[PDB]
Amino acid sequence: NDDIEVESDADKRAHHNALERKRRDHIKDSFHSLRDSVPSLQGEKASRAQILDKATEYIQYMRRKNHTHQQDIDDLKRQN
Amino acid sequence: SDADKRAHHNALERKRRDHIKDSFHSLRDSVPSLQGEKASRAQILDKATEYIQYMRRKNHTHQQDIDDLKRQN
DNA sequence: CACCACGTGGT
DNA sequence: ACCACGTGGTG
């Protein structure tokens, strides 16, 4: 835009700031959705570090749980 | 002091930021869609959210296949 | 000592 | 598009 390039400094500042608010809101949102996707804290409190941490923890748990399910499938597929 | 008081507050936050930085790393590596890719913190959170949901689904259905192979056998 | 958001300055 | 810092305030 041709207005954008010729806009005032007050206009530049305000914008820079507005874009950062928007960036932070996206992330705050994304932390929300991760929070709710993880049953160890489905929808209560939890600091950003806990969300990231319990999220890594869950992924590992699930993997363990998955290796266990697929064996019991193979072995039930032996019986069947 | 009142000055030395501020240095500490600041030092403790730097620590907070480092914890979150490291934790983003590990989450990054635990998600196969992000391995080897350059990702923004928003991507990591988003692609992670995606994976965790996928895993939950896929595990659930595999449970079903157990019940039905258990209802079959 | 944890937590958090903001404005700002730096690619 | 994105990121890290210092800050002021909360428990």
Side-chain angles (χ1 to χ4, degrees), chain B residues 19-70:
Chain B
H19 182 186
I20 296 176
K21 190 183 310 172
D22 255 17
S23 295
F24 260 110
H25 192 121
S26 303
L27 217 201
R28 204 203 60 242
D29 300 351
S30 296
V31 176
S33 351
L34 278 345
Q35 301 172 341
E37 251 72 40
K38 312 165 199 190
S40 75
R41 279 156 123 86
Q43 290 181 219
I44 299 197
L45 266 354
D46 283 350
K47 298 209 185 172
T49 296
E50 261 187 327
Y51 181 62
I52 290 176
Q53 290 291 11
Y54 166 65
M55 274 321 221
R56 307 183 60 188
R57 273 255 49 95
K58 164 226 139 168
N59 262 242
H60 183 43
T61 110
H62 289 341
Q63 224 148 47
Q64 297 196 43
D65 311 338
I66 275 166
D67 295 356
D68 292 353
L69 233 51
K70 170 171 300 182

Side-chain angles (χ1 to χ4, degrees), chain B residues 6 9-10 13-14 17 21 40-41 43:
Chain B
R6 250 173 257 198
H9 188 229
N10 287 174
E13 175 82 356
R14 205 135 43 227
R17 296 197 294 258
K21 190 183 310 172
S40 75
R41 279 156 123 86
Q43 290 181 219

Side-chain angles (χ1 to χ4, degrees), chain A residues 52-63:
Chain A
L52 269 354
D53 285 352
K54 299 209 185 171
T56 302
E57 268 119 80
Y58 195 70
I59 280 174
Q60 294 310 310
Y61 164 51
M62 299 256 100
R63 286 188 175 129

